[PDB]
């Protein structure tokens, strides 16, 4: 299932259907539109899970790993570099667990760094002779591998145990289709031995 | 002539 | 609740009738005969998958009809809730 959003919607690093986002922007609000630089999917070279460097901010020159990207506002966020401190445990007469949350950053402020020399580079998309599209650095002239990142589900295929209601891999990949010219209905009738002799009468369509 | 002025109700939204 | 039998409430004339008016000298009953309808036939119940209902329908018909007719006799004689029956 998917949620619908008004055209005048502002993205705030929160899930659109989440309670925090709902309380931040009620369904009856329409805020001023922020200018977002148009960057296409074929030109968005900032992925999730790769090491990047910070250009401007309090942590100038520091490097961190990207943990999330928001294409709507051209935002990229790194874990624990550009941080402001906030209290998460709030009660009537008790406080604590003051954690550093981190603010989002723009593509003009975050640029990819190659793992060879660990120095900032500019990334340009190139088409390899093998039929693959891999990012190629221009300052040094080297390819940057795709930063594989775990999915939000939290399960890795290397360690998975089948439950009572999961098919085995061999059963799932077993091929038993015989491509003949019979419908599913006819094949099921033949398989189960259901015999029907009489046929439908003339039916007019108009 | 029996001239009468019918009252006009305010819009319900306000 | 009685509504799950299912039973449904209705409002109309509530009468206590024996088969004849109170002026009838034959105010006592001897035997009733009740014919089951085509809806409650044995074959219909078997198709409906109600094998043990074949006797339940008879029991319900007998209980309801005989109670109604005996109570009509009693109230024709002059007995009611606060004048409970003596015979």
């Amino acid at each position: 299932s998917k949620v619908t959003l008004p055209p005048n919607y502002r993205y705030g690093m929160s899930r659109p259907g989440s309670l925090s986002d709902k309380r931040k922007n009620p369904p009856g609000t329409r805020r001023r539109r922020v200018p977002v630089e148009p960057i296409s999917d074929e030109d968005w070279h900032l992925f999730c899970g790769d090491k990047v460097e910070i250009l401007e901010g309090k942590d100038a020159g520091k490097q961190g790993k990207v943990v999330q990207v928001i294409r709507q506002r051209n935002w990229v966020v790194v874990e624990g570099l550009n941080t402001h401190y906030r209290y998460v445990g709030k009660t009537v007469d008790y406080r604590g667990t003051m954690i550093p949350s981190e603010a989002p950053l723009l593509h003009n402020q975050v640029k990819l760094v190659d793992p060879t020399d660990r120095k900032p580079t500019d990334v340009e998309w190139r088409f390899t002779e093998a039929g693959e599209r891999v990012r190629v650095s221009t300052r040094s002239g080297r390819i940057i591998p795709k930063p594989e990142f775990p999915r939000a589900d939290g399960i890795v295929p290397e360690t998975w145990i089948d439950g009572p209601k999961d098919t085995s891999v061999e059963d799932a990949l077993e091929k038993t289709y015989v491509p003949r010219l019979k419908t599913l209905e006819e094949e099921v009738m033949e398989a189960m031995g259901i015999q029907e002799t009489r046929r439908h009468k003339k039916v007019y369509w108009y | 002539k029996k001239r009468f002025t019918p009252p006009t109700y305010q819009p319900k939204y306000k | 609740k009685p509504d799950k039998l299912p039973l449904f409430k209705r409002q109309y004339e509530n009468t206590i009738f024996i088969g004849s008016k109170t002026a009838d000298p034959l105010c006592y009953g001897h035997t009733q005969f009740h014919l089951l309808p085509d809806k409650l036939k044995r074959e219909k119940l078997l198709k409906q998958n109600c094998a043990d209902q074949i006797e339940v329908v008879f029991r319900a018909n007998a209980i309801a009809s005989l109670f109604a007719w005996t109570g009509a006799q009693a109230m024709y004689q002059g007995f009611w809730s606060e004048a409970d029956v003596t015979r």
């Binding site: 998975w160 089948d162 209601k165 999961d166 491509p179 189960m192 | - | -």
Partner: protein
């Protein structure tokens, strides 16, 4: 006044307005006013035997998927009739006039489950 945006269902009218909710009919009206239900009009669920079925509603998580290749008429023909046509043409017995032996149905009015008129719901 009455509403106009609300749906005009059978709950919003008089006693004489008894509109169906979308269920298919299952019979007609008999002689003495009762409803005669036709057995053939009632759908019969063709439910298979799942006792010895070794498949589950979910697949293994490590099982690989495949590239999306939707089945087309060309692929179906290549799979079901192309080898037979090629073998018969090599043998020299191929008859262009008669194709009913290869699964081709010149007329759909004969068989039970017709394709264009769509005589079957599902």
């Amino acid at each position: 006044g009455a509403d106009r945006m609300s749906k005009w269902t059978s709950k919003r009218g008089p006693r004489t307005f008894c509109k169906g909710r979308g269920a298919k009919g299952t019979g007609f009206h008999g002689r003495d006013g009762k409803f005669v239900q036709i057995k053939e009009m009632i759908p019969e669920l063709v439910v298979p035997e799942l006792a010895g079925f070794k498949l589950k509603p979910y697949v293994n998580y490590r099982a690989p998927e495949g590239t999306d290749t939707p089945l087309t008429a060309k692929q179906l023909f290549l799979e079901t009739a192309a080898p037979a046509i090629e073998k018969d043409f090599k043998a020299g017995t191929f008859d262009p006039e008669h194709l009913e032996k290869y699964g081709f149905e010149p007329t759909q009015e004969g068989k039970l489950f017709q394709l264009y008129p769509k005589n079957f719901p599902r």
